[PDB]
Design a protein around this ligand. Sequence first.
Ligand SMILES: Nc1ncnc2c1ncn2[C@@H]1O[C@H](COP(=O)(O)OP(=O)(O)O)[C@@H](O)[C@H]1O
Ligand SMILES: Nc1ncnc2c1ncn2[C@@H]1O[C@H](COP(=O)(O)OP(=O)(O)O)[C@@H](O)[C@H]1O
Ligand SMILES: Nc1ncnc2c1ncn2[C@@H]1O[C@H](COP(=O)(O)OP(=O)(O)O)[C@@H](O)[C@H]1O
Ligand SMILES: Nc1ncnc2c1ncn2[C@@H]1O[C@H](COP(=O)(O)OP(=O)(O)O)[C@@H](O)[C@H]1O
Ligand SMILES: [Mg+2]
Ligand SMILES: [Mg+2]
Ligand SMILES: [Mg+2]
Ligand SMILES: [Mg+2]
Ligand SMILES: [Zn+2]
Ligand SMILES: [Zn+2]
Lengths: 317, 317, 301, 301
Amino acid sequence: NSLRGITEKKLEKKDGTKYIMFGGKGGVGKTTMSAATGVYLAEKGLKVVIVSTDPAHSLRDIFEQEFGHEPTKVKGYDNLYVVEIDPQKAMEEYKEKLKAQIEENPFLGEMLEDQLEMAALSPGTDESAAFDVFLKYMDSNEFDVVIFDTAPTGHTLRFLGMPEVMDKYMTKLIKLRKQMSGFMKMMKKLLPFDYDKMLEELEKMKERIVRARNILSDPERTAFRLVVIPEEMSILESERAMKALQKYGIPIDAVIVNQLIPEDVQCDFCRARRELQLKRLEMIKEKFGDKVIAYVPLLRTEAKGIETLKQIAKILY
Amino acid sequence: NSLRGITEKKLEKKDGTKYIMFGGKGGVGKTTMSAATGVYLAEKGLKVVIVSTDPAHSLRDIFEQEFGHEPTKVKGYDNLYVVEIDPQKAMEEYKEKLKAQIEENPFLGEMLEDQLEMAALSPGTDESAAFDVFLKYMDSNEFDVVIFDTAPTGHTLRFLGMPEVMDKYMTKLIKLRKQMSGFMKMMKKLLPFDYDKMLEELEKMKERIVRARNILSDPERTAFRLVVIPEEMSILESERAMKALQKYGIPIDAVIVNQLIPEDVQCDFCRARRELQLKRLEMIKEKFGDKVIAYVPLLRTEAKGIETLKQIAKILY
Amino acid sequence: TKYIMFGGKGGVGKTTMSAATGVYLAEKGLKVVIVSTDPAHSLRDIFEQEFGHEPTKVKGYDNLYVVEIDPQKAMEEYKEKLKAQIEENPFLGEMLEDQLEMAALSPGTDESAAFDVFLKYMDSNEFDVVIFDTAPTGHTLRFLGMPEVMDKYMTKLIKLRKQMSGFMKMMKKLLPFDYDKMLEELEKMKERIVRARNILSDPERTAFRLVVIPEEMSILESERAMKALQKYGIPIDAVIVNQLIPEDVQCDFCRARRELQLKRLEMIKEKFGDKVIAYVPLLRTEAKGIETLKQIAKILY
Amino acid sequence: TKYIMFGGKGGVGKTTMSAATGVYLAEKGLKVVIVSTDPAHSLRDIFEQEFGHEPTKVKGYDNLYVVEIDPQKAMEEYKEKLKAQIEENPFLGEMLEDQLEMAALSPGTDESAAFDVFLKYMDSNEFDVVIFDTAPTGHTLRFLGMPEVMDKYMTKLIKLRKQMSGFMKMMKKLLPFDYDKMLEELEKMKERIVRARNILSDPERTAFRLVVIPEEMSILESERAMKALQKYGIPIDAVIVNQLIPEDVQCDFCRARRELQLKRLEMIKEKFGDKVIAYVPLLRTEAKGIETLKQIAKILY
Ligand SMILES: Nc1ncnc2c1ncn2[C@@H]1O[C@H](COP(=O)(O)OP(=O)(O)O)[C@@H](O)[C@H]1O
Ligand SMILES: Nc1ncnc2c1ncn2[C@@H]1O[C@H](COP(=O)(O)OP(=O)(O)O)[C@@H](O)[C@H]1O
Ligand SMILES: Nc1ncnc2c1ncn2[C@@H]1O[C@H](COP(=O)(O)OP(=O)(O)O)[C@@H](O)[C@H]1O
Ligand SMILES: Nc1ncnc2c1ncn2[C@@H]1O[C@H](COP(=O)(O)OP(=O)(O)O)[C@@H](O)[C@H]1O
Ligand SMILES: [Mg+2]
Ligand SMILES: [Mg+2]
Ligand SMILES: [Mg+2]
Ligand SMILES: [Mg+2]
Ligand SMILES: [Zn+2]
Ligand SMILES: [Zn+2]
């Protein structure tokens, strides 16, 4: 319940799309918290999207409904949407589209299609298509609140520090073009017989990233939430990640301790395990104590159905 | 204990480096199983490396010792090594090295350094440096067994399907060079006054990936292990991943069910939870039944110290 | 602006006829320029006055100008500016300068700078009449047939850009992270050459004059050249027979030579008979001074 | 292989002297070629026989060959091959062909193809003596000063490649996933031009001959050209005064003209006096037939 108030406060200011994003180690339940917050926010009439760059398609399993690239309404909710990212499917569509253009020339076309196939099969495309859709929804509106289940770290978010580098490189390209512009004219006269485009795209990207950065670094719009478990791994990790997000100047309004073993436990096993969870809980209330901390228990049931989802919802709110 | 025999069998054939790689959902304990298998294999005199593309640096937390990029001996073991990947640190080193070269020219150098800064800050570099080191150790020897804690999926391993695409594109480039080679000569005569390199690098990469693919698709060298939990998420996920690895023709010798609640449990909580874990266990013995299945319990202690590590070791062996 | 241009074999006196026509047109108040792509700088010898690249008034004439082309000088002149502008990168400036020197020393630059100034004055006004002493042939003027080739190649580049434009964006989103310029320059050149071609193919604006000698070489040559100029659709209003031995001659030598010149004159009045033929004699004096120039002027007019 | 090359103003008879020297050298058993970059195809008119690009025997001489340069033809010839080879991509072939036509029509191709065949025969053997009727000047021959510029630019490219080589690999590992060729061609050209320059600057191999007329134009011109050739360190073994009016002349016309020719002859024996001067008269007949050719031959030898 401890989180509700903070959320409510976040919603009002800076009218427009509000962003919420959960982060934490693998497991640890951030996809879970995302789905739950989506359901809760969708309970009040609100138009909320949950975007997921998960290739494992976790939201498919949690919701039990398949989701395409385009936003899909979920579970009879008129107002709740989820965006699943498949770079491969997209890629097939782009291939159809390209093939359509290349009819006049097969050789040019088979070549370009090959280059694309290689591009898609390259190691960067997951994270970079993730990037593309992220920017698409940072620039977007028509969604009252956006929940990123893309799992952020300072290291995944390192692209936020680019615009300055882009500035330096751009001024370099401008100096260069000024030096060159004279020479190429004399070559164009003595022996007759791209930059503006590179600068266009560079500047465009610079502005997109700068906007996104300004939105993310601003509360009243974006809320970063850490989710953790009472175990040293997730605690230390999320601490470091918190420090990197700090380096990007990002607000973290809340930490969520998850899968807590309930206070009623009897057999020695869960006795020991909960002793440990209490030690780690003191560790958490030490390191993360300056932040709002929420607690969710370890459910008797596995957390799957919308019922368990609404349950967790009320547990956080 | 059920896994030991299979491992032993894997070690003997195809003398050279033997590869073992664990995969599964976030959490689920694959870094854990990796560390444990590393310890176990290091117990018999064997030279074993555990490489981790984890930016969260899990092995630092589990072992409690810091690891650099170059292989580092761990915990008094003369024979046990772990490789942690930091792309950023590397990047700083590359920057020092570049700056050293650019002294004659600052403008060229500041530009190139800018391009690199942008490269490193780009969304692909984590996964692609992961790729680079992966290939480095596929091509490598002097390590008796290599354990990849890089978390593989069919989708991360999609780069294995490239060599054919590279073949098509290469033959395209050859046809092209044959068509061009005539023309450029007449231009070189009528109006006086890269390919071999592109083909060199393309072919080189093609052979590296082909070698790696052939090694990974071959038992007696590489063993892919899935680790799962008695929960629908990890089960379905690891099933799909198993199918993609199947598409790349990869052997999966073993599935490891982890964090099992021990058979002695009393209070109703763990009663319900273990009932569920049994249902999911039947689900597992159904889907994954054609594979060797190993069981590890949920430890009273959090799994951190080398003692818990050796414990889990004997539990699997 | 009216354009007059003389052509013919080496020697044969087209630089001479150019100078003379310049003087004659400058006699009536008219502003006339004689541009010369001669690296030989023949106009320097004929006029006796030195001429720079920029149009220079000649021989006390307020209205008569001539332009001499030196490519080397222009190159070197630009180099200084280049130095001033690219200080950093310092290495780049030296490379670019090297490319420039390599360019200037290349075999194309004479003819192509000739081309550049030609187009400069085809596009120009403020000169009532322009006289080109650049020596035209159909082969020198072959650049006039370009604009159609430029069209084909341009449409090729457009089809190409339309084919590429889709691919590049998709590549960009899959892997984040010149044509318009090439087409700009190509189209600009196409329009300059089309304009020039249209002016040159049009009388009331441009007059092409052939100059010849009563010898088979120049006759046959200028005939072929006439046929190429024909292929570009160019008017040739006049043929000028030059260095004719005057009708008063006595010793057997010039008797024989003038007999030959008469045979070749019938050859000329045969081949070139369909156009105006003018006759200039072989002057007792070498043709140098402005006096001989005005003399030849009145001889043609 | 020995090289002989004539130079001088338009007219002035260097094509003539070339043909004559060719005949004379072909009289003694010798294998001699006369190559001509004349688009005017003067040798076609002088010899009366047509000549293709490949060396053609002339006038029943087993040993006398001449090479006429037509660039257009060569281009067109290659186009067919290009078509046969690039079928797919079909679009590419049309673009490349367009670039080819655009190249051939460009103002540089005459002089630069002249250059190409020049280097072809400088590198060549199997011809005992080669006579270049391409009309040399220091300005035409300015390409000889390149190899040093090529050196500077090459070392620039090497420093550059060393600076880049480190960066590119690191970029490659950070983001997976021409010079040697440029240096190959640059160095090759540098060696060809250096060889040619060394041969041309060396007597016992190459003889540069200037031809002039007793008129201030050709005299001053060929003097300056002589000074440029001097700047490239070239031997000029002989000056040939041509079209001299014979000493038997009577009527006042040729009296005056030959007076002038004598003044200019003293000018020549002044400026060019330090080198061998040869004299050829103005022939009663136009110089065309092989008979007049052999005549001039004996006149020079
Ligand atoms: N409060 C909870 N009670 C019980 N199980 C939970 C709870 N929160 C999360 N889980 C379980 O933890 C597992 C990992 O959570 P998930 O959000 O899918 O991982 P990730 O955060 O890495 O995407 C899921 O199988 C989920 O069912
Ligand atoms: N047998 C086990 N008993 C108790 N805890 C375990 C066991 N195996 C794994 N864990 C815990 O599960 C968490 C996730 O495991 P880890 O391997 O770090 O995740 P990943 O596989 O995603 O790298 C770790 O904190 C680890 O301590
Ligand atoms: N009508 C003429 N009478 C006498 N000499 C002439 C006459 N026309 C030209 N010449 C001479 O012929 C030579 C070459 O003429 P020029 O016009 O310089 O050649 P080009 O036309 O090739 O430039 C000059 O020395 C000039 O003095
Ligand atoms: N010695 C000579 N006697 C008579 N006519 C000559 C003599 N030398 C050259 N000519 C004539 O002068 C004209 C031009 O000479 P040519 O050699 O063709 O010029 P270029 O040397 O510029 O090619 C030709 O028509 C030729 O007949
Ligand atoms: Mg998730
Ligand atoms: Mg891990
Ligand atoms: Mg002239
Ligand atoms: Mg000639
Ligand atoms: Zn219990
Ligand atoms: Zn007489």
